[PDB]
Each structure stands twice: as structure tokens, then as C-alpha cells.
Amino acid sequence: PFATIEESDLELALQIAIVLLKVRLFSDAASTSKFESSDSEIADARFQINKW
Amino acid sequence: EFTFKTGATYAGEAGYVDREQITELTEESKLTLNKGDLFKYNNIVYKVLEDTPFATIEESDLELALQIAIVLLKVRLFSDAASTSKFESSDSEIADARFQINKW
Amino acid sequence: STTTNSNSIGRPNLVALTRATTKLIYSDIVATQRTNQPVAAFYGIKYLNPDN
Amino acid sequence: QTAVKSRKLKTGITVELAQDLEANGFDAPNFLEDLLATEMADEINKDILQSLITVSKRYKVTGITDSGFIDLSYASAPEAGRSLYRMVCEMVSHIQKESTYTATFCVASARAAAILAASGWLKHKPEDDKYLSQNAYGFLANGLPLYCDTNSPLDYVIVGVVENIGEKEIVGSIFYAPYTEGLDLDDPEHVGAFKVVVDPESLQPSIGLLVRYALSANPYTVAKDEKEARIIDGGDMDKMAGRSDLSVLLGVKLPKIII
Amino acid sequence: FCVASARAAAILAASGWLKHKPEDDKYLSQNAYGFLANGLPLYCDTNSPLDY
Amino acid sequence: ITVSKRYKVTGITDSGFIDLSYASAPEAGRSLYRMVCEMVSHIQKESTYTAT
Amino acid sequence: VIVGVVENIGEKEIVGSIFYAPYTEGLDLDDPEHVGAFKVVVDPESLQPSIG
Numbered sequence: 001p002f003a004t005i006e007e008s009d010l011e012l013a014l015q016i017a018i019v020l021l022k023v024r025l026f027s028d029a030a031s032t033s034k035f036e037s038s039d040s041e042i043a044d045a046r047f048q049i050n051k052w
Numbered sequence: 053e054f055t056f057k058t059g060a061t062y063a064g065e066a067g068y069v070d071r072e073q074i075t076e077l078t079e080e081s082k083l084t085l086n087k088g089d090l091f092k093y094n095n096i097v098y099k100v101l102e103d104t105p106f107a108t109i110e111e112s113d114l115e116l117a118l119q120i121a122i123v124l125l126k127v128r129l130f131s132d133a134a135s136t137s138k139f140e141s142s143d144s145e146i147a148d149a150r151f152q153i154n155k156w
Numbered sequence: 157s158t159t160t161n162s163n164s165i166g167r168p169n170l171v172a173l174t175r176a177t178t179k180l181i182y183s184d185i186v187a188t189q190r191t192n193q194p195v196a197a198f199y200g201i202k203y204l205n206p207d208n
Numbered sequence: 209q210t211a212v213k214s215r216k217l218k219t220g221i222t223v224e225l226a227q228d229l230e231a232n233g234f235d236a237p238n239f240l241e242d243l244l245a246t247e248m249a250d251e252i253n254k255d256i257l258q259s260l261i262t263v264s265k266r267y268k269v270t271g272i273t274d275s276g277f278i279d280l281s282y283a284s285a286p287e288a289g290r291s292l293y294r295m296v297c298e299m300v301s302h303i304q305k306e307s308t309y310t311a312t313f314c315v316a317s318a319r320a321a322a323i324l325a326a327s328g329w330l331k332h333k334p335e336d337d338k339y340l341s342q343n344a345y346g347f348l349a350n351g352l353p354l355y356c357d358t359n360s361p362l363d364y365v366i367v368g369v370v371e372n373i374g375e376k377e378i379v380g381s382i383f384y385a386p387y388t389e390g391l392d393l394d395d396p397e398h399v400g401a402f403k404v405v406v407d408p409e410s411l412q413p414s415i416g417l418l419v420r421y422a423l424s425a426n427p428y429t430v431a432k433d434e435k436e437a438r439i440i441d442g443g444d445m446d447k448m449a450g451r452s453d454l455s456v457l458l459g460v461k462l463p464k465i466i467i
Numbered sequence: 468f469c470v471a472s473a474r475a476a477a478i479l480a481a482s483g484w485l486k487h488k489p490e491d492d493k494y495l496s497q498n499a500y501g502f503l504a505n506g507l508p509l510y511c512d513t514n515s516p517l518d519y
Numbered sequence: 520i521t522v523s524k525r526y527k528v529t530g531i532t533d534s535g536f537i538d539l540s541y542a543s544a545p546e547a548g549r550s551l552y553r554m555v556c557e558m559v560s561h562i563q564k565e566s567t568y569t570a571t
Numbered sequence: 572v573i574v575g576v577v578e579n580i581g582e583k584e585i586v587g588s589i590f591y592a593p594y595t596e597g598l599d600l601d602d603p604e605h606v607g608a609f610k611v612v613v614d615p616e617s618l619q620p621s622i623g
Contacts, residue, residue: 019535024521036159042623055250056178056567059258059359063217063251096361101449122362123276123459125450128262131254132445133213133423136194146416149219149247170233171592172585176567180249181343181355182256185313187370187380191422192389197209198442200427282531282553285546289553294481301473301500305513318564319557326553329483336488345560350480350501351487358564463529465561522588523573551572558574568576568586 053095060096061131062147065138069145071097079114082106090130093118097130210424210443212387215251217244220414241402244417248400254359255423259382260315260366262445263425264455267299277364277459280323289327292365292460296324297350299367299456307428307454309369309379311352316365318358320460321345324365330354363462368455381455383442385422426454469507475518476500476511485509526558 001022007013017023034040062068075081077093085091085100092098093115105126111117121127138144221240229236272278278295280288296314303311316324324330329349334340340347345354352367370380386399393401400419407414424442431440431447442448471479479485484504489495495502500509512519525535537554539547562570577587593606600608610623 016535018520019525021525032160036157036161038157054176055247056176056358057565059254059361061251061254063215063248064255065213094361099446101446119362119459120276122261123266123364123457125266128445128449129258131258133215133255133421136212136214136420139214139216139418146216146218149217149244151219151243170583171590172583174586175584177246178250178253178358178567179343179356179563180253181315182249182253182384184339184341184343184353184370185260185315185355185368186256186382186384187372187378188384188386189378190389191212191385191387194387195209195211196383196385196387196422196424198383198424198427202428282528282550285544286549286553287546289549290481290483294478297480298474298477300480301477301511301513304511305473308513318560322556322560323553325556325560326549335486349483349486356560356563358567466527466529466533520573523575555572555574558572562574562576566576568578570574570576571578 058095059131060094063134064147065132065134066097066130067134067138067145068147071095077114077118082114082117091127098122098127099130100127102126209439210422210441212385212420212422213443215248215419215421216416217247218414218416219244220412222410222412240415244402244415248417248419252419252421256382256384257315257357257360259423259445260368260455261360261362261364261457262449263382263429263452264366264368264457265450265452267295267302267456267458269298273458277461279461282463286327289323292324293327293329293348295458296348296352296365296367299365299458300350300352302456303367303369303454307369309371309454311367311369313355313370314348314352314365314367315355315357317360317363317460318356319462319465320363320365321354321356323460323462324354362459364457364459366455366457379426381426381452383422383424383426385424387420387422425452428453468510469503470510470512471500472512472515472518476509479509526554526561528557 001017002013005013005016005020005022007016014023018025035042060066062071071092074090074092074097077091081091083104083106085105086103087100090097090099098118102125105121106117109117109120109124109126111120118127122129139146219240221236226236226240229239266276268274268276273295278292280292282288300311303309325346330346332346334347334351334353340353343355345356347353368381372378372380388396388399391401399421400417403416403418405414405416406412422443425448427442429440429442429448429452430437431451434440434447440447480501485501486504487501489502489508495508498510500511502508527533527535531537531550532554537551539550541547559570562568575588579585579587595603595606598608600606611620612623613620
């Protein structure tokens with residue numbers, strides 16, 4: 001990718017590709033086999049509280 | 053092909069087996085048609101109203117030039133109903149309806 | 157470590173059918189009236205000036 | 209005066225396929241009889257919609273609509289969008305000018321309707337709870353329902369009139385008028401009966417379907433070179449082609465959509 | 468009231484502001500091309516050779 | 520995003536997507552609205568559904 | 572700007588882009604809308620609970 005895309009800016013060139021199907025957003029659920037091997041780094045959820 | 057996609061009619065005066073003998077439109081065959089004689093394009097069959105169509109229409113593209121003739125009354129879509137004698141001569145190629153199911 | 161890979165699946169559930177029918181618009185575009193004979197005749201009656 | 213014509217369809221299936229259809233979820237005797245009805249209806253629209261194309265008189269004006277149809281461009285505002293809406297309205301008056309009728313419908317291609325809708329003034333549901341009856345793109349500021357084609361390969365716009373005053377006085381472009389009376393029928397909206405055969409060589413059954421209708425143009429549409437005549441057959445499109453009053457077609461010229 | 472010929476009354480409708488049914492359930496009495504936003508009903512002529 | 524088929528016309532919407540400018544009236548914003556209407560219509564021509 | 576379609580005519584005929592279709596049938600759940608169960612472990616090295 002980014003060969004026919006002549007846009008100099010990295011961000012816009014990436015945004016160019018998504019509409020030309022070259023790159024693809026990888027937001028996608030994991031396969032079932034990933035969270036079973038007794039060695040699985042499950043993502044974490046973090047929260048912080050600040051007072052005004 | 054999907055019924056809604058084509059727009060051609062196979063049950064009627066056009067038929068399906070009859071489409072085999074219908075002349076296919078080409079870049080060369082355009083300057084031969086007359087009043088009467090049918091012609092098909094992308095399985096859609098038209099008949100020519102005014103003699104020698106695609107003569108006043110100077111559009112280079114074949115598909116567009118055909119679309120020009122539709123408005124200019126030069127040709128007419130032959131989507132039409134068959135005459136009653138077509139399905140009662142014991143030699144009658146009746147149009148077929150087909151389906152297919154794909155599983156996702 | 158018996159995962160799901162050990163298990164074997166069965167019938168895939170049939171979630172939803174899918175047919176494709178065009179929005180057949182002819183009950184409104186044209187006016188229909190059943191004919192009780194093989195040949196149907198519509199009377200066109202007109203009013204004329206003394207110059208027809 | 210016009211004699212009706214016939215449309216016939218036959219599909220046929222094997223008992224083996226029908227046997228597993230039940231085991232696969234569908235109701236083969238009931239599902240199959242539905243397929244032909246969808247097919248026949250889907251073909252009839254291809255007849256009626258493409259009959260208006262070969263009947264409606266072209267509406268041309270010298271300034272822009274010369275050479276048959278108007279060309280629009282994406283640039284510069286709804287200016288192009290509202291230009292088509294103007295040509296739509298003029299077609300309505302031209303119908304009332306000669307056919308003295310109100311032009312209570314409008315038909316256009318799918319791509320052709322969007323630019324007509326793009327001009328604003330295309331509220332989805334009507335303000336007044338009229339017939340609506342779904343099956344419509346919008347309802348326009350003129351109050352004319354707009355119908356989407358998706359089938360005719362023209363990129364056109366057609367305006368016509370459908371009126372049934374009552375009693376026997378029903379008037380509108382393309383009269384349809386199916387012919388089934390006298391035939392034993394269930395639910396008289398069926399318009400035609402089915403038929404099963406089972407051929408003898410094999411034993412797999414087949415199903416047939418027959419439909420008859422008139423599909424004639426409206427009166428006051430005498431063919432050219434005939435003019436003075438009083439037996440005009442309004443069925444043959446070759447004579448009625450262009451020589452109509454109660455419907456005016458208008459194509460649209462647009463840049464090609466890349467594939 | 469406002470009266471115009473058929474072709475002329477079309478471009479008048481083409482300017483928008485020509486909703487078919489009037490905003491209020493007033494006299495209307497049909498026989499009107501439209502009702503306009505100014506409140507003047509529009510009546511179609513179709514006879515005079517003027518386009519006025 | 521990653522599934523929807525791109526809709527490109529020749530004159531303006533080439534290269535996959537359309538550019539707009541703040542200048543000169545809603546003549547830009549309404550240009551997008553036309554493309555929305557075309558996209559809705561383009562769905563029914565090929566998928567026959569109502570695009571709700 | 573993306574235009575799609577969602578249609579659920581009724582019974583089992585449901586058609587629309589991106590079918591989602593979460594999978595929870597069979598599992599012991601509190602209200603069918605939870606879609607997924609929780610868990611608490613409390614590791615042995617420390618004694619701090621963790622929820623997944």
C-alpha cells in the first residue's frame with residue numbers, strides 16, 4: 001500500500017487507503033482458541049478519578 | 053441472473069429459446085437494422101421502429117447510444133406479452149423459472 | 157487442557173432467510189379493471205367545437 | 209379495441225429436491241407456488257414500466273431539453289437538483305394542458321430519482337394521510353408520489369395520471385386490465401391458475417402458470433399517419449410509440465458511475 | 468386569488484413553496500394547482516395563448 | 520467501514536471520496552446531501568431494500 | 572458517511588448489513604440482555620479479587 005497513494009502526510013495517506021481498501025481496520029473479535037492456552041494476556045480496563 | 057437486476061423479460065413474446073436466433077448488437081451490426089427486426093443487448097431485447105437507427109446518434113459508446121435511441125423513439129424495448137397462439141401449437145418453448153440457495 | 161478445539165460442532169443454527177423481491181409498483185402506476193371477454197374496448201368520447 | 213395477450217411460466221422440480229426441502233426448512237409445495245407469483249409479478253412490472261417508456265410522448269424544450277433529455281452536473285449547489293424538479297412540474301402542467309388531468313403519479317429511475325429528491329421538497333411521508341400505500345420514494349412538494357424503478361435502463365423521469373372517478377369511468381395511462389373471469393379461481397386477486405403435469409418418462413412434477421392481460425394505452429392517443437380513425441387498436445406499441453398525451457417521459461444525462 | 472397559465476404556473480410551482488394541500492383546512496374547494504406559501508391559491512388556465 | 524462498497528462517480532466523486540469547501544453558501548453541504556440520496560437510491564437498484 | 576439497511580420483516584426473515592448476532596443461548600444468565608457472564612477468582616499470591 002501507499003504506493004499509488006501520493007499524499008505526503010502519513011495520517012492522511014493512511015486515511016486515503018481505508019477508502020481504497022488497501023489497508024483495513026483491524027477492530028475484530030479474537031478467535032476462540034486465543035483465550036484458552038493457559039497463557040493469554042487478556043486486555044485490562046483502567047479507571048481514574050480526579051476531583052474539581 | 054437476479055430478476056430485479058436485469059430488467060429483461062423471458063416469459064412473453066421474447067421467450068428464451070427465441071433469444072438464440074435474435075441478432076446480438078455489435079459495433080458492426082448497428083448499421084444494418086430496419087423497421088421490424090429485433091435485436092438484443094445484455095439479454096434485453098428491443099425492436100427497431102425507424103429504419104437505420106444509430107445513424108443520427110453520433111455517440112461513440114455502444115451502450116449509451118442505445119440508451120439515446122430509447123428516448124428518441126428510434127427503437128423500443130420489446131418487453132411484451134406473447135400472443136395467445138404461442139403456447140398452444142404443441143411446439144412451444146415455454147420460459148423457465150430457476151432458483152438457487154447459497155448458505156452463508 | 158481440553159479446549160473448544162477438542163469439541164466438535166454440529167448443526168449451524170439457521171439465523172435468518174433472505175429473499176430479494178423488487179418493490180413491484182404497478183397497482184398504483186396504472187389503472188386496472190378486469191375484462192370479461194378476450195378483447196377489451198375502451199370508449200373514447202370527446203366534445204368538439206363546430207370546427208371538430 | 210385490443211385483444212389480450214398471454215404470459216406463461218414453468219419451473220419444474222425433482223421429488224428428491226422437494227423431499228429434502230421439507231427436511232431443510234421450507235415448504236416445497238407452498239414455497240414453489242410462491243416463486244412463480246413473485247417472478248410473474250416481477251416480469252409484469254418490467255412490462256408496465258417499460259410500456260410507459262414506449263408510449264409517453266417526449267417533452268422537449270428549445271433552450272435546454274432539446275435533443276431529447278436534460279443533462280445535469282454535480283457541481284454548484286442544488287441548482288442542478290432543483291432544475292430537474294422544474295422540469296417535473298412543467299410536465300405536470302403539460303399533461304393538464306392537453307390531457308386535462310391532474311397527473312397523480314411520477315416514475316423515475318433509481319439514480320434519476322435521487323437528484324429529484326436532492327432538491328429538497330421531498331418529505332418522506334405525506335403531510336396528509338392519503339393513500340401513501342408505501343412503494344414510494346417520497347411525495348414531493350407538488351403532492352405527487354414518486355416511484356423508484358431500479359429496472360429500466362434509461363435514467364428517465366415519467367409523469368402520468370391515474371384516475372377512477374367511479375362506476376365504469378376509469379382513465380389512466382396503460383390500462384393493464386387482466387383477463388381471468390370465467391375461470392375457476394380462489395382469491396380472485398390471483399389472476400391466473402396453476403397447473404401440474406408430472407411427465408411420464410421421469411416422474412418429477414412440473415408447475416405451470418398462465419396470465420392474460422390487455423395492457424393498452426389510454427384513448428386520445430391516435431397513431432401518427434392514422435390521425436382520423438375510429439377503430440384504433442391501442443395495444444400495438446409500434447403505433448402508440450410517442451403518440452400519447454397522458455404521459456411525458458424525460459431522460460437524464462449523468463456521468464457514468466465507476467465500477 | 469392568483470391565476471396563471473399551465474406552463475407559467477409550473478415554474479411558479481418550481482420555485483418551491485407550493486405544497487399541494489393548504490396549511491389550513493380552509494375553503495380549498497379543489498380546482499387549484501396549488502396553494503402557495505403566500506396564501507394565494509393558484510388556478511390553472513390551459514386555454515389562453517398567453518402564459519401569463 | 521471495512522465491508523461497505525465504495526460508491527464513486529466519474530465527475531466529482533472519483534478517487535473514492537468527495538472534497539468540500541466552506542466557501543459559497545450551503546452549495547457545499549447540500550452537495551453531500553445529494554450524494555446521500557444517490558447512495559440510498561443506489562442501494563435499492565442493487566439490493567432492493569429500503570435503506571432505513 | 573455510510574448508508575446501509577436494516578430490515579426485520581418478521582418471523583425469521585431478518586436482513587441487514589453486519590449481522591452481529593451475539594451468542595449466549597444455553598448459558599445460565601440473569602435476564603437475556605446481559606450477554607456474557609462475570610467471574611471472580613482472587614489470586615493466591617496476593618488476596619486481591621479480580622473480575623473478568
